[PDB]
Design a protein around this nucleic acid. Structure first.
Ligand SMILES: [Mg+2]
Ligand SMILES: [Mg+2]
Ligand SMILES: [Mg+2]
Ligand SMILES: [Mg+2]
Ligand SMILES: [Mg+2]
Ligand SMILES: [Mg+2]
Ligand SMILES: [Mg+2]
Ligand SMILES: [Mg+2]
Ligand SMILES: [Mg+2]
Ligand SMILES: [Mg+2]
Ligand SMILES: [Mg+2]
Ligand SMILES: [Mg+2]
Ligand SMILES: [Mg+2]
Ligand SMILES: [Mg+2]
Ligand SMILES: [Mg+2]
Ligand SMILES: [Mg+2]
Ligand SMILES: [Mg+2]
Ligand SMILES: [Mg+2]
Ligand SMILES: [Mg+2]
Ligand SMILES: [Mg+2]
Ligand SMILES: [Mg+2]
Ligand SMILES: [Mg+2]
Ligand SMILES: [Mg+2]
Ligand SMILES: [Mg+2]
Ligand SMILES: [Mg+2]
Ligand SMILES: [Mg+2]
Ligand SMILES: [Mg+2]
Ligand SMILES: [Mg+2]
Ligand SMILES: [Mg+2]
Ligand SMILES: [Mg+2]
Ligand SMILES: [Mg+2]
Ligand SMILES: [Mg+2]
Ligand SMILES: [Mg+2]
Ligand SMILES: [Mg+2]
Ligand SMILES: [Mg+2]
Ligand SMILES: [Mg+2]
Ligand SMILES: [Mg+2]
Ligand SMILES: [Mg+2]
Ligand SMILES: [Mg+2]
Ligand SMILES: [Mg+2]
Ligand SMILES: [Mg+2]
Ligand SMILES: [Mg+2]
Ligand SMILES: [Mg+2]
Ligand SMILES: [Mg+2]
Ligand SMILES: [Mg+2]
Ligand SMILES: [Mg+2]
Ligand SMILES: [Mg+2]
Ligand SMILES: [Mg+2]
Ligand SMILES: [Mg+2]
Lengths: 155, 124, 188, 260
RNA sequence: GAUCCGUAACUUCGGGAUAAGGAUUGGCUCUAAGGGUCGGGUACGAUCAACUUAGAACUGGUACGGACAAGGGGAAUCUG
RNA sequence: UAUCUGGUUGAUCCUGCCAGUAGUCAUAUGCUUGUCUCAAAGAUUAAGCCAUGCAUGUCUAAGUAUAAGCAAUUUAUACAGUGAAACUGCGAAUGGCUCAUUAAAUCAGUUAUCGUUUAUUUGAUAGUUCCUUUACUACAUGGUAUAACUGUGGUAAUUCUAGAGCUAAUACAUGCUUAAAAUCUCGACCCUUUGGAAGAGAUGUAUUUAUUAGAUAAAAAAUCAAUGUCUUCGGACUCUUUGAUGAUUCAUAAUAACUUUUCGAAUCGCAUGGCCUUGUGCUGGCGAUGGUUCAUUCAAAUUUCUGCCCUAUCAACUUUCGAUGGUAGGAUAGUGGCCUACCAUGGUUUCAACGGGUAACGGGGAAUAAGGGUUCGAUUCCGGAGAGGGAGCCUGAGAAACGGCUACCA
RNA sequence: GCGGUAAUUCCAGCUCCAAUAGCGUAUAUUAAAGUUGUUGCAGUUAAAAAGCUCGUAGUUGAACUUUGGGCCCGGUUGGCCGGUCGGAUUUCCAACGGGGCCUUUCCUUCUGGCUAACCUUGAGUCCUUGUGGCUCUUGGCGAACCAGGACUUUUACUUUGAAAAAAUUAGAGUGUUCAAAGCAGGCGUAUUGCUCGAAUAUAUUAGCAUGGAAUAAUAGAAUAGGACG
RNA sequence: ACCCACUCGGCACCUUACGAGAAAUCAAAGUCUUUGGGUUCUGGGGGGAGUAUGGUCGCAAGGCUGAAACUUAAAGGAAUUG
RNA sequence: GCCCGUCGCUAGUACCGAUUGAAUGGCUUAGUGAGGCCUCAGGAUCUGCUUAGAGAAGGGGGCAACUCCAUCUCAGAGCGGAGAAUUUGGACAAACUUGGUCAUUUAGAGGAACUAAAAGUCGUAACAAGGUUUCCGUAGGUGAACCUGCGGAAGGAUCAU
């Protein structure tokens, strides 16, 4: 989430061990570090262009993606820098030889290299435990607005 | 802490307890081959019953199926070996048929008498 | 003892969870070093599988490195002026990581005026060459240089004293120094 | 459960040992060593259940303590010592040598070898890293760590070893069309030359295999062991050469020779 | 006393209720929130004047509505 | 291995249950009981209570022998055979037993550690330790303080022990050491250039911090600040070195320092031999126990995906006193509201949350045979949990241990 | 349902039946039960359609978008023959499957590495009057997958396969004297060893991997804020 | 306005019954052991009993939701003859 | 013939119910708070390092001057280590007292159902136009079945002007 203010915290936010020498005058004023997550996921430009900090970011941060890669549709963006997704699926009951609708909600971190709104399908991938609940990180967006600009005014 | 010693029971018992026809049919078989038990008939019917089951299931499979050919021939060759199954009908549509006496006829009880040596099933 | 398990602590649904098993030695926590300043006192602690940890209480000196200057010195730790986690750490001059301290500057001055032949604030033949080959880049920085007058320098603690028994850090510079300078006066 | 388990119950014992259900409760627990528990063959099984040299387990200690048996060149007094795949077992009395090598059924076979072949072995490098002081090392499947290997040597490449010294005398790259021994899966013991490999970034690379009956099959890369070039192994193969006849074929063969 | 927590049967739904049952309260030293007024072309600046409420340290022979002031409570029967 | 039969009526056809019938790795009980093999067995109720005995100890040529022990022979006047006691080391965290708790827990299949610890086995791995660096540091080897024992004792009573006197180490506590080379900082001087120099100190590994290298998405240029190698003194730099992964601040290395300074053999058994300048000089065979770092193996701890019985006469639940997320810290072996501070208002639910019940440990499986199903699994294997009930902790690689301790309750 | 004075049901004697080293009883569970019904129930009058309509959750939901035709390659059964000393492969035939092409036809895609295959042909030919046949390098196949870049509408279903403890189950082999079992054993020169074994199947939801593109969803381009260059 | 023929959608009757049902009967109660168009609701021998209890609605009367123990071999439906 | 209810006897089951009734089990407020662990102190005794004296020893190498290393022994002094009893403050937290809550049980005068049940007493409600057709809903009333009013149904005793 973020939304500016950058240095807004009590502690000074910085990327660890990335050092910008004040004696040497540079043009970007801050040396920025980033990596490529792997599994062919594009590291979004906003991560490289961005000023944000987020030590929990898969592109700019200290975590790493390994294990399960899952998708789900976004059912809540309320908590700052983290979302909740619903993953539907059909569960097979053999005796009746049919299925039933089931779902799980999976809490997952979202870097502010992404702008997410409710309804977007999103791809996530597994994490070291980030928080009490969140075990996953948002690694790509498969939707955009779900046709928001198509809601516009009278012709 | 030892591996369980496995076991199985060798007989089955008829549901209808009193069936005058089955009873008569049973006694004769005993009175012929010289058996002390209805169980000695019950046992054979159970052995025969599992054989027919195996046979039945094999038949539902497609002809020349790898499992069917392998296991089918084994069943046949086992049955033929002991002398229940005729050499002429080797193809297991007759093992599906068979019947009890074909098994009874092969007991050492009977062979010792059929060959003389006894001149009674009971002396046998 | 202190237990680090999640088996207490209601589930994400909010449900209350029954007690399963008992406190295991391996989910154990321990009490804070709450390490303070002066008169070195260190107590080792026996951790999992041999493996000493050094719990500091009362440290008077640490190893502080000037980053842009590519050196490190051992200096007295004067005090704790700022902490982001808790203010009581500052009130009580408690040493933990990320704490903002004030240290010495006399060791850092000595090396500088020896290395650059300059003397912040306000004869040998070989040395003269070195100093002349140097400077032009002796320009230091405003906010960092004006601090030597005080004979005290702002620095951040980068180590974990209740863990390693070391209190170590780096002189504050640039943007980061700016940040804490603002915080200091805008509350003071 | 409070610490390392020191016992092994029968029926919890790996099946390729071919131990019998009764006549006991426990089975020997393989000691820590060069090979993993479930994939090893303790000396007590080999000197008793395989070679029938001893009757009691107590006699297997008797044989061992006299320094008869030796593994890969050293003496190995451990009763439960975990001897694995590729290892060399040598009786100087009886003048016999052995290399532990798999069946077609996925069992360790009694396999006699020459005197000179018993002076070397093969191992698969499970990793290659950069050690302290900048010295690169390789680690093989039996736990050997060998300093200063060839730079061209990479993971999964098999390696020929001196055994009288820790040195590598040659290596074989993992390439399309190299002879391969399958260790793992239900294809364990088959020998197939490597048709082609599937990548699958993120885990478990598949490896396609064909013996020569011109039969095909697949296992995970981890379970593939390169033993050589097509038709030419670097070690002597056991009879049957990992062809895996069908149940019918075996039945035919076994009943093909009935002649007394 | 006051602040905070917590409060049953029953009921004409208005009550019962300060139900019952609990914690806290000095001194001193700090922090934060809450306002007025004037000039702005057709974001903020400058100045002055008020005890309230919450939070935090320190401190004492564990005391603090320190005198004064200030409801005992609960379950029933008869009866208006 | 796809079967029905008796009972409502005066008779009739239905509906429908009751009864019959057959099996049970299903218990009990009654009567009867000759042979072979096979062999479960205080689960159910009371994870109720326990007399007594036993169930955990352990020595190789190879840590410690002045037994005032035995044996004596056999080279042994330091020791040398055998060996009580005791010290040291290691084990007692395995095994065995039970099924009380436990309902998204455990458990199963499937995952993750780029999120950690690991005695041991196995394979690797250590020339650096002192000091202003000629009158020097024990290295041919530095220090005591204790058991057993001897002797004096206490108590009704225990695997209770006190005072006094001895003596060991692979216990305790100290502490020397070894090649060459190169790179770094200083710099006495001398002389002005384009500048170069004698010799002084620093540099094992580990610890803590900061900085740097660890390229590769296909190719070329100018300039600033430093400053490298080669001069055919305008100048050139030509070949220029690169490990792994899907992915890293990875492995690994370099710079400035840091440390009540980790480790770097004061150990043991067999043999005793070479080699001359005859010093008991200087060398030297096999293998034992150690020892730091890495790997391996035996493990462990957390961990992804999906899957539980009855219940709405449980519809809302979660933040009291963390509920859901953010930042920083603390703590842990380590991730993480695991804890704290600050901030925010989140998290779950008719696709059944939350609550309740379970005469509930989960699983491999068991019984019943047209099929679909139904019912069961305390119990030979696997996993978990416990040791009368709670909590706490010492030892250690590993225990929140109970045939360990401490406290409260019974 | 028997017994109230000739009791085919009681108490016995006699005789008879069923199972038999075993047989009865009690309790539970399963089959019989299509009396829990997915397969597979019943609801006018036997037990059972809410007084009525609206309506969210749930379940369910019309038709239509590459079909048709042509060419090629090589598999496995079965026939009529057998060439051969029980099994063999060619050509003749059907039959049922697999792959790849051209028909206006993305197969993600460029930049090389690779090529197995012919539009090739460079010579001719073992040999049946010759397109029956393959060795054979100099113009001319992409996809068969390597690896680097640049990007990709989402699912369900089905196929094959990897990964998969043993015991139990199904089941092959083997004459524990039989059998339940066990995983043994079987041959000799039985005086100094020879030797076959210790199979196979199931393992279903989920996860992984691969083939398919019917069936059933999902997304797209209408204020053009579209598509390619 | 009325007559005749057609056609949608109505309320109903008549005759049949291929078909269905235990029958009475039924153009649905048919197209069901040759058992699957979609979907909602209820019943599972008779009593006990629409009772006890809790919840909830109501001014009240009462409505909605709604058990068990125990008892019992029948209760019941359609049709035939008396 | 069948058949309904009150009333009366025997036996059994569950219900309501003064006792602000009783018991077990799981959580838990508030108050009290053991113990080990961490921590501020403590210092029985028992030594280290350093400084100086007095009495002897051993020599780096000299004719007198000159001088190092280790080790033992008593007046006295500067700056640290171990360490028992004790003890500050903490987290962890058994347990005790008094309450609350949930679940599973449970006594009770008396009240009031049902059944065994077929019969006994009183009547005749139903079954035939059951002798006032029956039945539903609602309401009021009566020893008991039941009667009566308003509106329904035919399952009526009418498929019909
Ligand atoms: Mg938030
Ligand atoms: Mg503390
Ligand atoms: Mg062992
Ligand atoms: Mg009151
Ligand atoms: Mg106060
Ligand atoms: Mg103000
Ligand atoms: Mg009165
Ligand atoms: Mg009055
Ligand atoms: Mg009757
Ligand atoms: Mg009758
Ligand atoms: Mg009559
Ligand atoms: Mg029955
Ligand atoms: Mg018990
Ligand atoms: Mg038991
Ligand atoms: Mg007990
Ligand atoms: Mg002696
Ligand atoms: Mg155990
Ligand atoms: Mg001492
Ligand atoms: Mg590289
Ligand atoms: Mg000598
Ligand atoms: Mg509701
Ligand atoms: Mg946080
Ligand atoms: Mg809130
Ligand atoms: Mg529910
Ligand atoms: Mg239980
Ligand atoms: Mg179990
Ligand atoms: Mg169960
Ligand atoms: Mg039990
Ligand atoms: Mg308790
Ligand atoms: Mg305990
Ligand atoms: Mg015990
Ligand atoms: Mg124990
Ligand atoms: Mg009579
Ligand atoms: Mg009689
Ligand atoms: Mg029977
Ligand atoms: Mg079906
Ligand atoms: Mg029915
Ligand atoms: Mg009726
Ligand atoms: Mg009805
Ligand atoms: Mg209706
Ligand atoms: Mg409704
Ligand atoms: Mg459709
Ligand atoms: Mg499959
Ligand atoms: Mg008719
Ligand atoms: Mg009382
Ligand atoms: Mg009742
Ligand atoms: Mg009448
Ligand atoms: Mg009358
Ligand atoms: Mg009447």
């Amino acid at each position: 989430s973020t939304e500016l203010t950058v240095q807004s915290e009590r502690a000074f936010q910085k990327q660890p061990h990335i050092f910008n020498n004040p004696k040497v005058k540079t043009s970007k004023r801050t040396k920025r570090w980033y990596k490529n997550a792997g599994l062919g996921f594009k590291t979004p430009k906003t991560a490289i262009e961005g000023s944000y900090i987020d030590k929990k970011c898969p592109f700019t941060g200290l975590v790493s993606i390994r294990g399960k890669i899952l998708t789900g549709t976004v059912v809540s963006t309320k908590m700052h820098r983290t979302i909740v997704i619903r993953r539907a699926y059909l569960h097979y009951i053999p005796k009746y030889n049919r299925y039933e609708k089931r779902h799980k909600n999976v809490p997952v971190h979202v870097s502010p290299a992404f702008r997410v709104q409710v309804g977007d399908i999103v791809t996530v991938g597994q994490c070291r435990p980030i928080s009490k609940t969140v075990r996953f990180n948002v690694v790509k967006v498969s939707a955009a607005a779900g046709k928001a600009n198509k809601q516009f005014a009278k012709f | 802490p030892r591996a369980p010693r496995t076991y199985s029971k060798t007989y089955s018992t008829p549901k209808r307890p009193y069936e005058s026809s089955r009873l008569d049919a049973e006694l004769k078989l005993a009175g012929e081959f010289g058996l002390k038990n209805k169980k000695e008939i019950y046992r054979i019917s159970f052995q025969l019953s599992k054989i027919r089951r195996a046979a039945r299931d094999l038949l539902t499979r497609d002809e020349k199926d790898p499992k069917r050919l392998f296991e089918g021939n084994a069943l046949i060759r086992r049955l033929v070996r002991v002398g229940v199954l005729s050499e002429d009908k080797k193809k297991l549509d007759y093992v599906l048929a068979l019947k009890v006496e074909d098994f009874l006829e092969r007991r050492l009880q009977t062979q010792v008498y059929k060959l003389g040596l006894a001149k009674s099933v009971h002396h046998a | 003892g202190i237990s680090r398990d999640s088996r207490h602590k209601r589930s994400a649904t909010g449900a209350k969870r029954a007690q399963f098993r008992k406190k295991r030695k391996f989910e154990l926590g321990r009490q804070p070093a709450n390490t303070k300043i002066g008169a070195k006192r260190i107590h080792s602690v026996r951790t999992r599988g041999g493996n000493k940890k050094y719990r500091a209480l009362r440290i008077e000196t640490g190893n502080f490195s000037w980053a842009s200057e590519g050196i490190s010195k051992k200096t007295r730790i004067a005090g704790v002026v700022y902490h982001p986690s808790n203010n009581e750490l500052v009130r009580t001059n408690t040493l933990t990581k990320a704490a903002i301290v004030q240290i010495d500057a006399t060791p850092f001055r000595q090396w500088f005026e020896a290395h650059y032949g300059q003397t912040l604030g306000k004869k040998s033949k070989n040395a003269e060459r070195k100093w002349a080959a140097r400077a032009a880049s002796a320009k230091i920085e405003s906010s960092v240089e004006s601090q030597f007058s005080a004979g005290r320098l702002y620095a951040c603690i980068s180590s974990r004293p209740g863990q390693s028994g070391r209190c170590d850090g780096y002189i504050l510079e640039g943007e980061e120094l700016a940040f804490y300078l603002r915080r200091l006066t805008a509350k003071k | 459960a409070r610490g390392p388990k020191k016992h092994l119950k029968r029926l919890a014992a790996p099946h390729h040992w071919l131990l019998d259900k009764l006549s006991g409760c426990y089975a020997p627990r393989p000691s820590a060593g060069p090979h993993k528990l479930r994939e090893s063959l303790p000396l007590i099984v080999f000197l008793r259940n395989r070679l029938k040299y001893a009757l009691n387990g107590r006699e297997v200690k008797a044989i061992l303590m006299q320094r008869h048996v030796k593994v890969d060149g050293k003496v190995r007094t451990d009763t439960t010592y975990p001897a694995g795949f590729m290892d060399v077992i040598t009786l100087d009395a009886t003048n016999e040598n052995f290399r532990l090598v798999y069946d077609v059924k996925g069992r360790f076979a009694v396999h006699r070898i020459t005197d000179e072949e018993a002076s070397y072995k093969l191992g698969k490098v499970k990793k290659v890293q950069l050690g302290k002081k900048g010295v690169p090392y390789v680690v093989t499947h039996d736990g050997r760590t060998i300093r200063y290997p060839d730079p061209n040597i990479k993971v999964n490449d098999t390696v020929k070893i001196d055994l009288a010294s820790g040195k590598i005398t040659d290596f074989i790259k993992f390439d399309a069309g190299k002879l391969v021994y399958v260790t793992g899966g239900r294809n364990l013991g088959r020998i197939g030359t490597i048709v082609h490999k599937e990548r699958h970034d993120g885990g478990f690379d598949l490896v396609h295999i064909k013996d020569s009956l011109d039969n095909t099959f697949v296992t995970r890369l981890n379970n593939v062991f390169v033993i050589g070039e097509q038709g030419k192994p670097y070690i002597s193969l056991p009879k049957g050469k990992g062809i895996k006849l069908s149940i019918a074929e075996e039945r035919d063969r076994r009943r093909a020779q009935q002649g007394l």
